[PDB]
Short mmCIF file of C-alpha atoms and ligand atoms in Angstrom, two decimals:
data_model
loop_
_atom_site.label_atom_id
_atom_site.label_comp_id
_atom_site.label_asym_id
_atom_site.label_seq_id
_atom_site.Cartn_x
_atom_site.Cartn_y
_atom_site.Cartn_z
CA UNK M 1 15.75 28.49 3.11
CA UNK M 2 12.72 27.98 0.39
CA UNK M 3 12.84 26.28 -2.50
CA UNK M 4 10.25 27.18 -4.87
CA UNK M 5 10.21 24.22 -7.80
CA UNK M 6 9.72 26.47 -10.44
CA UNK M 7 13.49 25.40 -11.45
CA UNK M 8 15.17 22.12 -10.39
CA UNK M 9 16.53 21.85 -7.28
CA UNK M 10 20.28 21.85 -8.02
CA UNK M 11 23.35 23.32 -5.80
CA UNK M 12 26.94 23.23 -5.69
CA UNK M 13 27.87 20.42 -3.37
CA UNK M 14 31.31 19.56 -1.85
CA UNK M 15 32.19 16.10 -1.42
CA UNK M 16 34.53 17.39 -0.45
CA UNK M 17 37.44 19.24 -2.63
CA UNK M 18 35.23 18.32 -5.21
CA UNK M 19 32.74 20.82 -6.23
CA UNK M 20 29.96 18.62 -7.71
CA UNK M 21 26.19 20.44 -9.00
CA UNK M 22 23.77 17.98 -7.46
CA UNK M 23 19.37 17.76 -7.90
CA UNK M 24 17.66 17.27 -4.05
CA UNK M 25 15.56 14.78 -4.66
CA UNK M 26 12.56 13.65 -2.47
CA UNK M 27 11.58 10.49 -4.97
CA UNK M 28 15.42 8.95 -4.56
CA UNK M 29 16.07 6.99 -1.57
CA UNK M 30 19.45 7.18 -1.87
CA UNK M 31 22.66 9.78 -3.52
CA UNK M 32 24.09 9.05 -6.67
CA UNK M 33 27.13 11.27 -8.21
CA UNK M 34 28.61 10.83 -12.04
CA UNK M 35 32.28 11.85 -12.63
CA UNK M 36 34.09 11.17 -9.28
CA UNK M 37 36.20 8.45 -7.96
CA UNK M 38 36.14 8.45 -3.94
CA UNK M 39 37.67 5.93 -1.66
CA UNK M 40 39.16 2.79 -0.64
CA UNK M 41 35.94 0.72 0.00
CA UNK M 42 32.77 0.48 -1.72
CA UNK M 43 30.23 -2.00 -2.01
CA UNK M 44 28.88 -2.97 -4.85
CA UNK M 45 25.29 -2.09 -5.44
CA UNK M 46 21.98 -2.29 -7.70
CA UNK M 47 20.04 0.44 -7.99
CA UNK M 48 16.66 0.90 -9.67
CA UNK M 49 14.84 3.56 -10.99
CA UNK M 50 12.96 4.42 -14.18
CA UNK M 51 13.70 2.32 -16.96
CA UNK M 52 15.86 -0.16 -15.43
CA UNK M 53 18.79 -0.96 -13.18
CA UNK M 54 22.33 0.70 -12.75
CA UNK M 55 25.44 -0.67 -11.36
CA UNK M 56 26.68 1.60 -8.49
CA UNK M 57 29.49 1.67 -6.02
CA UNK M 58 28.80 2.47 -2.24
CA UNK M 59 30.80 4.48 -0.44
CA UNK M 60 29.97 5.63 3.28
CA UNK M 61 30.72 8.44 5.78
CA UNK M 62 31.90 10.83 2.92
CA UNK M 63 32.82 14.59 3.63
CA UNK M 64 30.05 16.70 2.45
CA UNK M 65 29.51 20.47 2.67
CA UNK M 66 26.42 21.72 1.60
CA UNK M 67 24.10 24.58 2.33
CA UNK M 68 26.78 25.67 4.50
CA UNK M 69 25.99 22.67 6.59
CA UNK M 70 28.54 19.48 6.94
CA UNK M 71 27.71 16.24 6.89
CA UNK M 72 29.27 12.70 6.73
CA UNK M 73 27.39 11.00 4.06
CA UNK M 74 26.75 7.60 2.25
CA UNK M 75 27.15 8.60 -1.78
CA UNK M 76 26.73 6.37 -4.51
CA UNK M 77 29.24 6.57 -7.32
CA UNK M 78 27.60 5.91 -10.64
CA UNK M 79 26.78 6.53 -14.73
CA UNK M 80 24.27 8.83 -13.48
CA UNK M 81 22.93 11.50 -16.48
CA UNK M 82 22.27 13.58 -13.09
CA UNK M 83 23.24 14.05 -9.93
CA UNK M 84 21.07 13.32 -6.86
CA UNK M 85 20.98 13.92 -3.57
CA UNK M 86 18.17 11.48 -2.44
CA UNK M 87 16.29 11.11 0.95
CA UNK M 88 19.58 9.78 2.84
CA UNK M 89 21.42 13.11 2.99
CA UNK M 90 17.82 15.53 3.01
CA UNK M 91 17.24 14.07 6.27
CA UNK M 92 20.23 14.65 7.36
CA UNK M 93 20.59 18.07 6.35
CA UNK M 94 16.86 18.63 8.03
CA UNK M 95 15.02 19.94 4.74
CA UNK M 96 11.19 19.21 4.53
CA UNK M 97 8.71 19.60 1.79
CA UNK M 98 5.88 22.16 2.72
CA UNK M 99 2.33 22.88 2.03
CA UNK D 1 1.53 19.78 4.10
CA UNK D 2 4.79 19.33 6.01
CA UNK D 3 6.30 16.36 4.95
CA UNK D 4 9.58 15.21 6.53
CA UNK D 5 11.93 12.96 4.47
CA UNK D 6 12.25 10.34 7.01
CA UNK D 7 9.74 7.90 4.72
CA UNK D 8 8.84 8.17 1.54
CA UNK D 9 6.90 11.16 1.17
CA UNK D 10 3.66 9.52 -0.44
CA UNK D 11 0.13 10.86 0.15
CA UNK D 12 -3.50 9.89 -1.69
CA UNK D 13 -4.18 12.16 -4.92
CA UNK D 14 -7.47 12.01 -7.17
CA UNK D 15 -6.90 11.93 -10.73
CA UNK D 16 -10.55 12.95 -12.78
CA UNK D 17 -12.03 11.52 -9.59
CA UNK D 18 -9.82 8.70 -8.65
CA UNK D 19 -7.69 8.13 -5.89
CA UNK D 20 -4.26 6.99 -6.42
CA UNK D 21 -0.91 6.81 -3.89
CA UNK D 22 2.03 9.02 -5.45
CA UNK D 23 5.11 9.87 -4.22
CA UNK D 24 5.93 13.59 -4.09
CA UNK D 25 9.28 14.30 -6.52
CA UNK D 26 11.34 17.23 -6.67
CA UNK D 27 13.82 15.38 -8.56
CA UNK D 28 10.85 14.51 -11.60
CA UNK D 29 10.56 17.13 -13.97
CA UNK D 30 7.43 15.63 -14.72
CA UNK D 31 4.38 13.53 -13.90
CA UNK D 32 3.82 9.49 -14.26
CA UNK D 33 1.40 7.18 -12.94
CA UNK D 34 0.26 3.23 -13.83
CA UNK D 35 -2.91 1.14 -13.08
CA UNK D 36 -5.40 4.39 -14.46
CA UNK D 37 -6.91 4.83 -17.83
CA UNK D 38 -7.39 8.73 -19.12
CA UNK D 39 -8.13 7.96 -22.66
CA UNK D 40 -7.55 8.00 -26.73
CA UNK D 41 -6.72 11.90 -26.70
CA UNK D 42 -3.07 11.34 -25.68
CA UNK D 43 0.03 12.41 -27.31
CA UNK D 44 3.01 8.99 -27.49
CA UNK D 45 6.09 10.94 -25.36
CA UNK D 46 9.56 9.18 -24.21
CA UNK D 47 10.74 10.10 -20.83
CA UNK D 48 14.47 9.09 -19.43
CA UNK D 49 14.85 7.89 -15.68
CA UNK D 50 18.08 7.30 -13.99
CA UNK D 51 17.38 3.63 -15.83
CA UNK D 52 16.78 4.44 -19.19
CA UNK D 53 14.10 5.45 -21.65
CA UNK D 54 10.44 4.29 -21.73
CA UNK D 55 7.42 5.13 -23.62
CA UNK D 56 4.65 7.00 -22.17
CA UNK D 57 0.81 8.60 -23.22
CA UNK D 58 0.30 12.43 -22.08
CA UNK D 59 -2.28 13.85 -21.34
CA UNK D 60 -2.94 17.39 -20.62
CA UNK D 61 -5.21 19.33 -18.32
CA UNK D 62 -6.25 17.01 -16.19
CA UNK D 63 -8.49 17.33 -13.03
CA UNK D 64 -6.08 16.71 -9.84
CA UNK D 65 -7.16 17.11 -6.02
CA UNK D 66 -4.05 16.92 -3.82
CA UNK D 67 -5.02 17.65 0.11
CA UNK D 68 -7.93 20.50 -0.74
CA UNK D 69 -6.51 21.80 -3.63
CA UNK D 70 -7.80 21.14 -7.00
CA UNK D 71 -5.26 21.57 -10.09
CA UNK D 72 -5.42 20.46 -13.79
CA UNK D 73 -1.77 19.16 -15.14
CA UNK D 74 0.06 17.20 -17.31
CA UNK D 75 0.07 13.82 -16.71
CA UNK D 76 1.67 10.95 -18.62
CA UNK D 77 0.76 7.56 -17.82
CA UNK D 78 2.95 4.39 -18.19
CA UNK D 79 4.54 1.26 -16.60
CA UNK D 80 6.06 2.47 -13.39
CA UNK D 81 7.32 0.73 -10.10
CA UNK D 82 5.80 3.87 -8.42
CA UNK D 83 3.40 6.87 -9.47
CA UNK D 84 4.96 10.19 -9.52
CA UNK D 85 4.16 13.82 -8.76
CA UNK D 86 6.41 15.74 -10.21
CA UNK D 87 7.73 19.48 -10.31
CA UNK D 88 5.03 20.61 -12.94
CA UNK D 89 2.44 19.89 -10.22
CA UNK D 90 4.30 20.36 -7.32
CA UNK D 91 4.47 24.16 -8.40
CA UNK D 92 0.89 24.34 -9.57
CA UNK D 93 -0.08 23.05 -5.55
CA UNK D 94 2.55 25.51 -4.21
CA UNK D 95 4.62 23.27 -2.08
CA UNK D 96 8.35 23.88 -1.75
CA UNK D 97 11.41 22.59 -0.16
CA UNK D 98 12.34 23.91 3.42
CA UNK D 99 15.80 24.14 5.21
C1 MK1 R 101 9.76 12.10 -15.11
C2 MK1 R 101 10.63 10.94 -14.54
C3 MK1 R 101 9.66 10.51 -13.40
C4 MK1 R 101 10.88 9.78 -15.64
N1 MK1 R 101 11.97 11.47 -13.98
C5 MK1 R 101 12.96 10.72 -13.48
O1 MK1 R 101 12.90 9.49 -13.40
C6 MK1 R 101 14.22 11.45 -13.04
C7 MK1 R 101 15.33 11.15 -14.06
N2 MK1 R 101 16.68 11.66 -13.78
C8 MK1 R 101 17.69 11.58 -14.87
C9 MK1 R 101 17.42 12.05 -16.36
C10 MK1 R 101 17.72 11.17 -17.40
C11 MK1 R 101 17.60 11.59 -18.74
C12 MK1 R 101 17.18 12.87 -19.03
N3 MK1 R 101 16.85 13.82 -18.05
C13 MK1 R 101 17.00 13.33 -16.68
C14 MK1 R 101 17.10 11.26 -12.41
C15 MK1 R 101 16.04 11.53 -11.32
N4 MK1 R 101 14.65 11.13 -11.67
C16 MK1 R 101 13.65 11.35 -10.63
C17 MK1 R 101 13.67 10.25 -9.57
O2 MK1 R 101 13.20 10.76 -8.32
C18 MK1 R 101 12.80 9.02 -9.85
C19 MK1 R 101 12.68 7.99 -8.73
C20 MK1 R 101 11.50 7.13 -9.18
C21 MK1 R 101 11.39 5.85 -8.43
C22 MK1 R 101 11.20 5.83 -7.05
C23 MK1 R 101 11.30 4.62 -6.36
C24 MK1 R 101 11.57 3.44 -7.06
C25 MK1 R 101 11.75 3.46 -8.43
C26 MK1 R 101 11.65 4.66 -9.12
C27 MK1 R 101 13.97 7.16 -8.59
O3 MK1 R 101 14.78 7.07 -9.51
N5 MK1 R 101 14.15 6.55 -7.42
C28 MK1 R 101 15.27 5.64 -7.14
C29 MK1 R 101 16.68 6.28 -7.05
C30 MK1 R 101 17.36 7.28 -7.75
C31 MK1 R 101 18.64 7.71 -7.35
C32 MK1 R 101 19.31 7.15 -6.25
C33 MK1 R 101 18.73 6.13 -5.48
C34 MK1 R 101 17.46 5.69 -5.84
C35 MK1 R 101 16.50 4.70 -5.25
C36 MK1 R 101 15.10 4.94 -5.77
O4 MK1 R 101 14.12 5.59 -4.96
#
């Protein structure tokens, strides 16, 4: 369905269990969530964005419902003041930007 | 005026005339671009990325042409990795996000 950007972009995700409120983002590359721990293996990782760098953990093929689609995800875990679903999982989900 | 996420969704936008490369942001609340010069009338404004906090000069109503529409916005210039448009003139060129 539309989203008009009038308001930000947030939804209730699922990673899943977890109900996490997340911004789609078409300026991230990747997905970054605050307040979760996830999973045996991560990487670590460096991410950069405005402002500096932030220490992330990388954790792939994660359970995600949202917009009552599924999809196995990679999801960053990280001091984020917000969280993002970037480019990684929009594609994956099929959402465009229009017009 | 279909974008699909699979690159970076970047296309050529003329600010007062010039052409600049920004990537299209529904995760930016607002606007930010380097590398152009719009003037003394600015107000000083701090923004916060996913990095941290930087200074920035805004500007307001300013001329932009984004594919063959012409809009005036708010625009803050600033050091950035990458110019920004974000959701104050995504809305004002009507473009949304499609699932
Ligand atoms: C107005 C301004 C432009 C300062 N907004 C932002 O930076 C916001 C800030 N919030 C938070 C905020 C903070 C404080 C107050 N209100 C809001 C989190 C989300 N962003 C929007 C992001 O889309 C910004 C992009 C910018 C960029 C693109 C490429 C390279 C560098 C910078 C961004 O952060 N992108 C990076 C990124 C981000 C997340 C995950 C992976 C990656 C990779 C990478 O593309």
């Amino acid at each position: 369905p539309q989203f008009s950007l009038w308001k930000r972009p947030v939804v209730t995700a699922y990673i899943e269990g977890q109900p996490v409120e997340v911004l789609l983002d078409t300026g991230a590359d990747d997905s970054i969530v605050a307040g979760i721990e996830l999973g045996n293996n991560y990487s670590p990782k460096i991410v950069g964005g405005i402002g500096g760098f932030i220490n992330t953990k990388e954790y792939k093929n994660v359970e995600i419902e949202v917009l009552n689609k599924k999809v196995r995800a990679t999801i960053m875990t990280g001091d984020t003041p917000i969280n993002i679903f970037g480019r990684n999982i929009l594609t994956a989900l099929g959402m465009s930007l229009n017009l």
